[PDB]
Design a protein around this ligand. Structure first.
Ligand SMILES: [Mg+2]
Length: 222
């Protein structure tokens, strides 16, 4: 009963959020705020690097410059290109699923291209790789815009689309678009409250093995 599967890229297809968690927790740790990658998830999930730094100064008065907003983005860029890994079970899932697929992401088109090419996934999605940054300024998830755009490119009504998301903002975006959502907590940056957070945001179900996608989708279709 689904004519389209929409995937997010970061934290779903590619293990990119563990790399952001690593960069950020180290930049925080060095600035006077010791925090492990694991706690990044528990304390700051979803939040932008900018708002995290605002919350840290608010809660602990740690001196944190604007010079450290760009060290993050450029360190992340470099580390993604060198180290980013595909999520386990992606190629298993894609082998089995018969439903058409696309990517709707908040990441820039350039970043998407770089990550997907590296892990060899691009040919399985192009040209159906949609960045919310290309739609306009401030059209980013939790707005439904990117999802509605991807569904319309396939001519699929939103009630016939299932979305795979690891983030609360993507889940709200997808629900706001009238779609059904599978939360995914199998990426390496996951944390104890992750599945509950995804459920609370409107995930119909949560999986931690990408290999479970074919079964979970079939069951959701009834
Ligand atoms: Mg994501």
């Amino acid at each position: 009963g689904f004519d389209l599967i929409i995937f997010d890229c970061d934290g779903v297809l590619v293990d990119s959020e563990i790399i952001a968690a690593q960069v950020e927790s180290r930049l925080l740790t060095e600035a006077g705020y010791p925090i492990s990658v694991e706690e990044m998830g528990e304390r700051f999930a979803g939040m932008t690097w900018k708002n995290i730094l605002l919350q840290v100064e608010s809660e602990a008065s740690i001196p944190l410059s604007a010079s450290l907003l760009d060290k993050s983005e450029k360190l992340l860029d470099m580390r993604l290109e060198r180290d980013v890994k595909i999520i386990d079970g992606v190629k298993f899932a894609l082998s089995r699923l018969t439903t058409p697929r696309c990517i709707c992401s908040n990441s820039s088109s350039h970043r998407l291209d770089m990550m997907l090419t590296k892990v060899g996934l691009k040919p399985y999605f192009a040209p159906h790789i949609y960045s919310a940054k290309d739609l306009g300024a401030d059209r980013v998830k939790p707005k439904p815009d990117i999802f509605l755009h991807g569904a319309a490119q396939f001519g699929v009504s939103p009630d016939r689309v299932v979305v795979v998301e690891d983030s609360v903002h993507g889940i709200h975006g997808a629900r706001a678009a009238g779609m059904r959502v599978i939360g995914f907590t199998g990426a390496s940056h996951t944390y104890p409250s992750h599945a509950d957070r995804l459920t609370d945001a409107g995930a119909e179900t949560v999986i931690s093995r990408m290999q479970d996608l074919p079964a979970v989708i079939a069951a959701m279709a009834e």
